[PDB]
Amino acid sequence: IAALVVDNGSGMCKAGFAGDDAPRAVFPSIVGRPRDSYVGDEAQSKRGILTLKYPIEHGIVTNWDDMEKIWHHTFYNELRVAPEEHPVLLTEAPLNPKANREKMTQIMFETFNTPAMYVAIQAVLSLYASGRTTGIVMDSGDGVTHTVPIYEGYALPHAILRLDLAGRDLTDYLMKILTERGYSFTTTAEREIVRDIKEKLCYVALDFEQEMATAASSSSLEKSYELPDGQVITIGNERFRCPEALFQPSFLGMESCGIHETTFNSIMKCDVDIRKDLYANTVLSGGTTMYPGIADRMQKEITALAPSTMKIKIIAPPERKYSVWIGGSILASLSTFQQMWISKQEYDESGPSIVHRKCF
Amino acid sequence: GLGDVRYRYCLTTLTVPQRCIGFARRRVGRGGRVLLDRAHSDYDSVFHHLDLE
Amino acid sequence: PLLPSDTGQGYRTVKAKLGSKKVRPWKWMPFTNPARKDGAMFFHWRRAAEEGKDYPFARFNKTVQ
Amino acid sequence: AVMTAVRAWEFWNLKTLQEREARLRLEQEEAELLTYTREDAYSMEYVYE
Amino acid sequence: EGEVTELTPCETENPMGGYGKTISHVIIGLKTAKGTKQLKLDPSIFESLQKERVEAGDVIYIEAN
Amino acid sequence: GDEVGALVFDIGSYTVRAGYAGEDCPKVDFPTAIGMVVEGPTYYIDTNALRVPRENMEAISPLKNGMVEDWDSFQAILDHTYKMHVKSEASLHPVLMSEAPWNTRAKREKLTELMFEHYNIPAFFLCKTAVLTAFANGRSTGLILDSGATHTTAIPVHDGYVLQQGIVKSPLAGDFITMQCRELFQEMNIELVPPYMIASKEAVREGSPANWKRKEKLPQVTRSWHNYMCNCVIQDFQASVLQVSDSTYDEQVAAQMPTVHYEFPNGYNCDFGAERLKIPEGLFDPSNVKGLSGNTMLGVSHVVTTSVGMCDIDIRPGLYGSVIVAGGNTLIQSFTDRLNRELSQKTPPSMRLKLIANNTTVERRFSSWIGGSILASLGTFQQMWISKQEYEEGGKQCVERKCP
């Protein structure tokens, strides 16, 4: 017997088994395609005859065959397990059309025929991992953004906010500015190298303007990084020019409310009676979202814009790159949730819609 | 005496976790699933007397 | 004043009885309603095999006179 | 013996506190259930009178 | 009556002197078909239930008074 | 799958709602209004465009007394919905919409034509909002009260059919509450310092002068847009202060409440007293409104009496079996309790009275959308579809033949 946990990040799949602390296998979620279509890094290794593909576009599915095959290869190589003797837990972004839910339910049941299945939003599982009752979740995921005010382990779809800005667009902008600095970054290797440089030295400025003054005056901000070719890159203001775009969509030519502005909008969309508690129950999301000076700066910005009459107690788990998967393992490791699973015969007797009848 | 044709409820207990369930009635649901609906009436908080005191 | 729903799982105790029992497939098949004279073609999640059966639910065509 | 006696009474009061918290946790937990088994839906279910 | 669910002591070092590895009293989780519960059991009764073959998964006749 | 991937849409006096069929809640919502920057032109929809400051917005509400105003705006808003939220081709998906008690047949034909031809919808349907809400309560013959943002109307229903005669287009709504807040500000003299023009809201106490900083980067806005975002602020304040005296109002009784410490965008925060209860009592009777001798409006109990009397005798017991609420302005506290008190007083005990127990914001507002999804779910309704083939055949004129 085994327990299966499947976390499908915006651009990287990270699966594991209930009770485990970390995913079994992890890798970017890309799909090869011959001009046999291979999976993720498997496809990447064969770039010559396989073309990169992202089934999780916008944080959303594209073609059922693509993730059919990602699961195929997952099971056959990474897990190398027989899930059809174990429950299958899956997660989704909020506001997903019922079409996708029924489609994935049917694909599971027919293609793989696993006994027990169940689905639940990523944000609520991450909150479960965070061990708190009522609050607001910021979904600074990897490909898309959302703001989920969860109450009593229960969320209101209307109150949620959406935005398809995440580490991929941040990396694209950082690549653009680095090229503007006098460098160049075109192919996949360059994209991943830019993401590497970001993950290494990029951080979140406190006072972006005095931060500019210091970067243009204090060269300490300007730092040296060995590129894969060995090239040393001076990186000063650009260490944090991109992250400030999060509060300023104008950085990329986009127009919208900043991240904390978005959060204030969301909390307003809730009921006032518990917005103080929500403030007390901030959240963070995304392994691509732990950059230094981020939690404190966001705390300051909320304290400013959010009325001080309420308590703004931030919550910044430094280990949130897997929050969703960790919460999923925790949930799958609960007694009262075992009953809640959904059997294959239940589908055979009710069809895919049973998921929308029970899977909540 | 109020005369509600469909709001006819009754007491009973359950098989495995036997206990006074309170005024409840079975009812069909989506996907052809029966569901027990337990009501909430004048004696809701006192659903344990037994022996018809 | 809630309502319990049917539970079939209960516990991980049902290893067998499935490998011998295929899950009869369901398809988002088209269909037509007789009650619609124009016979508008709509869709059902029928269990594949239940294809072509007359619209079972349009037998309520009772009207005033 | 006096120190021994006062330690005994201190234990008595700690134990009253421990019993109080035991009662609190028990009265808090009081879990319920919102499911009923498939077979417990079809056959000679029950009878009211 | 019921089925022995669990069994635990109420450890306390309060007793005078000595390494305080002492049990204030025992906690016994018992389950009947009606339900489950546990009761406060004095230290001496653990020796008794040793006397009997008390093991997880069996029932017992515990005279209250 | 006796449900097809249909989408239900609900647009009320205050905001715009929609969502899949058979679901618990509408998927999304956003302000009824749209910000216009005259130069196709620059349309500002949803918060990121509307509330966030820009230059030269002339916000426009394409609605009026539940009527279509700016057809181009409706088309643009539908496209905005589709792209920004749904991201689907409803041409592949049946759709339907509610309707007003009084929507012109001309505009209904116009929208039917537009839907079928442009939006390529596969099927359509229409029905009155109050009918949807009554369905939501599982009711066939009752009285609907809605304090939408625009009006405070009452409309009875019978066998799932509205009484055309029962329409009451009372003015009072969240607009009236905004006017009350404005007269309150006047009598106690606080201006409107909108948040957007405040860089920092510095520490300030009760009575303290408005201390704040402005962000220099603030291109000027229009009086329309700025006033309407101020109106949003005012509605937020009302919600923070919503309440009505449960009995005959008294100034000192209302003052007995501890003045609630409400803060403003500038950071200033004073404490408000009996005014929040002096104001609403007029809603229950406009005549008693001090200063404003409103008489044209019918007090709450007066509305009840009018609606009941204008019906016929036989069903009035049936309508009294149900009483329903709806609308953006229905957020008011002491709403239903004082409503029923005024009933028990003015409403004779001769006929048994019964209300509808629903007060959550979800129910209290989107009962109509819930009823719409409810109807969409039903398996029998499919014969009542409206195939696009039939529309192609008989133009948009099929509506009169098939819709009375």
PDB file of C-alpha atoms in Angstrom, chain A residues 192-292:
ATOM      1  CA  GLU A 192      18.113  29.504 -17.204  1.00  0.00           C
ATOM      2  CA  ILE A 193      21.357  31.405 -16.594  1.00  0.00           C
ATOM      3  CA  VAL A 194      19.418  34.625 -16.019  1.00  0.00           C
ATOM      4  CA  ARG A 195      17.153  32.766 -13.602  1.00  0.00           C
ATOM      5  CA  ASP A 196      20.276  31.428 -11.874  1.00  0.00           C
ATOM      6  CA  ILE A 197      21.755  34.909 -11.504  1.00  0.00           C
ATOM      7  CA  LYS A 198      18.444  36.136 -10.107  1.00  0.00           C
ATOM      8  CA  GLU A 199      18.250  33.266  -7.628  1.00  0.00           C
ATOM      9  CA  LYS A 200      21.830  34.015  -6.590  1.00  0.00           C
ATOM     10  CA  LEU A 201      22.141  37.772  -6.137  1.00  0.00           C
ATOM     11  CA  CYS A 202      18.804  39.417  -6.902  1.00  0.00           C
ATOM     12  CA  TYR A 203      16.897  40.726  -3.893  1.00  0.00           C
ATOM     13  CA  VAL A 204      14.054  43.094  -3.003  1.00  0.00           C
ATOM     14  CA  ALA A 205      14.951  46.724  -2.356  1.00  0.00           C
ATOM     15  CA  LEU A 206      13.654  48.455   0.760  1.00  0.00           C
ATOM     16  CA  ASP A 207      13.611  52.087  -0.421  1.00  0.00           C
ATOM     17  CA  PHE A 208      13.900  51.596  -4.161  1.00  0.00           C
ATOM     18  CA  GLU A 209      14.957  55.207  -4.763  1.00  0.00           C
ATOM     19  CA  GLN A 210      17.634  55.371  -2.083  1.00  0.00           C
ATOM     20  CA  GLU A 211      18.452  51.866  -3.293  1.00  0.00           C
ATOM     21  CA  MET A 212      19.108  53.380  -6.732  1.00  0.00           C
ATOM     22  CA  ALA A 213      21.241  56.053  -5.086  1.00  0.00           C
ATOM     23  CA  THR A 214      23.281  53.396  -3.280  1.00  0.00           C
ATOM     24  CA  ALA A 215      23.633  51.176  -6.362  1.00  0.00           C
ATOM     25  CA  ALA A 216      24.824  54.112  -8.477  1.00  0.00           C
ATOM     26  CA  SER A 217      27.050  55.280  -5.600  1.00  0.00           C
ATOM     27  CA  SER A 218      27.846  52.204  -3.482  1.00  0.00           C
ATOM     28  CA  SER A 219      29.333  49.649  -5.873  1.00  0.00           C
ATOM     29  CA  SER A 220      28.837  47.023  -3.154  1.00  0.00           C
ATOM     30  CA  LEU A 221      25.474  46.425  -4.806  1.00  0.00           C
ATOM     31  CA  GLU A 222      27.325  45.927  -8.085  1.00  0.00           C
ATOM     32  CA  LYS A 223      28.665  42.392  -7.726  1.00  0.00           C
ATOM     33  CA  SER A 224      30.535  39.745  -9.682  1.00  0.00           C
ATOM     34  CA  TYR A 225      29.122  36.433 -10.905  1.00  0.00           C
ATOM     35  CA  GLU A 226      30.894  33.695 -12.837  1.00  0.00           C
ATOM     36  CA  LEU A 227      28.814  32.975 -15.913  1.00  0.00           C
ATOM     37  CA  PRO A 228      28.926  29.399 -17.244  1.00  0.00           C
ATOM     38  CA  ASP A 229      31.417  30.632 -19.838  1.00  0.00           C
ATOM     39  CA  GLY A 230      33.237  32.206 -16.885  1.00  0.00           C
ATOM     40  CA  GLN A 231      32.309  35.783 -17.756  1.00  0.00           C
ATOM     41  CA  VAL A 232      32.051  38.089 -14.755  1.00  0.00           C
ATOM     42  CA  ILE A 233      28.946  40.286 -14.662  1.00  0.00           C
ATOM     43  CA  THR A 234      28.681  43.508 -12.710  1.00  0.00           C
ATOM     44  CA  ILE A 235      25.163  43.547 -11.247  1.00  0.00           C
ATOM     45  CA  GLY A 236      24.034  46.500  -9.137  1.00  0.00           C
ATOM     46  CA  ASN A 237      20.648  48.166  -9.458  1.00  0.00           C
ATOM     47  CA  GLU A 238      19.499  45.220 -11.579  1.00  0.00           C
ATOM     48  CA  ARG A 239      19.837  42.938  -8.548  1.00  0.00           C
ATOM     49  CA  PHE A 240      16.484  44.390  -7.485  1.00  0.00           C
ATOM     50  CA  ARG A 241      15.177  46.425 -10.444  1.00  0.00           C
ATOM     51  CA  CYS A 242      13.017  43.509 -11.585  1.00  0.00           C
ATOM     52  CA  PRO A 243      11.404  42.672  -8.198  1.00  0.00           C
ATOM     53  CA  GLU A 244      10.200  46.245  -7.743  1.00  0.00           C
ATOM     54  CA  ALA A 245       8.192  45.686 -10.934  1.00  0.00           C
ATOM     55  CA  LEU A 246       5.956  43.474  -8.794  1.00  0.00           C
ATOM     56  CA  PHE A 247       4.570  46.577  -7.093  1.00  0.00           C
ATOM     57  CA  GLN A 248       5.028  48.610 -10.308  1.00  0.00           C
ATOM     58  CA  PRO A 249       3.649  46.893 -13.429  1.00  0.00           C
ATOM     59  CA  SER A 250       4.845  49.955 -15.347  1.00  0.00           C
ATOM     60  CA  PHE A 251       8.329  48.417 -15.212  1.00  0.00           C
ATOM     61  CA  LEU A 252       7.274  46.046 -18.003  1.00  0.00           C
ATOM     62  CA  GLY A 253       4.827  48.432 -19.666  1.00  0.00           C
ATOM     63  CA  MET A 254       1.949  46.784 -17.804  1.00  0.00           C
ATOM     64  CA  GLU A 255      -0.666  48.638 -15.769  1.00  0.00           C
ATOM     65  CA  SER A 256      -2.293  47.200 -12.648  1.00  0.00           C
ATOM     66  CA  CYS A 257      -2.222  47.300  -8.863  1.00  0.00           C
ATOM     67  CA  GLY A 258       1.026  46.251  -7.231  1.00  0.00           C
ATOM     68  CA  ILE A 259       1.203  43.002  -5.314  1.00  0.00           C
ATOM     69  CA  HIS A 260       0.314  44.572  -1.977  1.00  0.00           C
ATOM     70  CA  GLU A 261      -2.134  46.903  -3.713  1.00  0.00           C
ATOM     71  CA  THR A 262      -3.748  43.791  -5.186  1.00  0.00           C
ATOM     72  CA  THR A 263      -3.842  42.258  -1.710  1.00  0.00           C
ATOM     73  CA  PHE A 264      -5.559  45.323  -0.248  1.00  0.00           C
ATOM     74  CA  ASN A 265      -8.098  45.145  -3.057  1.00  0.00           C
ATOM     75  CA  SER A 266      -8.699  41.488  -2.229  1.00  0.00           C
ATOM     76  CA  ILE A 267      -9.068  42.004   1.518  1.00  0.00           C
ATOM     77  CA  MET A 268     -11.552  44.757   0.730  1.00  0.00           C
ATOM     78  CA  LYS A 269     -13.420  42.248  -1.443  1.00  0.00           C
ATOM     79  CA  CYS A 270     -13.833  40.190   1.738  1.00  0.00           C
ATOM     80  CA  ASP A 271     -16.030  41.091   4.716  1.00  0.00           C
ATOM     81  CA  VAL A 272     -14.713  43.804   7.023  1.00  0.00           C
ATOM     82  CA  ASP A 273     -15.598  41.852  10.164  1.00  0.00           C
ATOM     83  CA  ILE A 274     -12.454  39.692   9.990  1.00  0.00           C
ATOM     84  CA  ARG A 275     -10.115  41.758   7.805  1.00  0.00           C
ATOM     85  CA  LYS A 276      -8.109  42.554  10.935  1.00  0.00           C
ATOM     86  CA  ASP A 277      -7.604  38.822  11.413  1.00  0.00           C
ATOM     87  CA  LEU A 278      -6.702  38.446   7.743  1.00  0.00           C
ATOM     88  CA  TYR A 279      -4.065  41.150   8.183  1.00  0.00           C
ATOM     89  CA  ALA A 280      -2.851  39.135  11.164  1.00  0.00           C
ATOM     90  CA  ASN A 281      -2.721  36.089   8.851  1.00  0.00           C
ATOM     91  CA  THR A 282      -0.638  37.122   5.856  1.00  0.00           C
ATOM     92  CA  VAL A 283       0.899  34.389   3.683  1.00  0.00           C
ATOM     93  CA  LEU A 284       3.610  33.889   1.067  1.00  0.00           C
ATOM     94  CA  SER A 285       3.971  31.484  -1.849  1.00  0.00           C
ATOM     95  CA  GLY A 286       6.528  30.271  -4.357  1.00  0.00           C
ATOM     96  CA  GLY A 287      10.090  29.002  -4.179  1.00  0.00           C
ATOM     97  CA  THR A 288      10.831  31.755  -6.704  1.00  0.00           C
ATOM     98  CA  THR A 289       9.543  34.286  -4.156  1.00  0.00           C
ATOM     99  CA  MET A 290      11.957  34.155  -1.178  1.00  0.00           C
ATOM    100  CA  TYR A 291      14.241  36.916  -2.284  1.00  0.00           C
ATOM    101  CA  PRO A 292      15.859  39.006   0.469  1.00  0.00           C
TER     102      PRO A 292
END
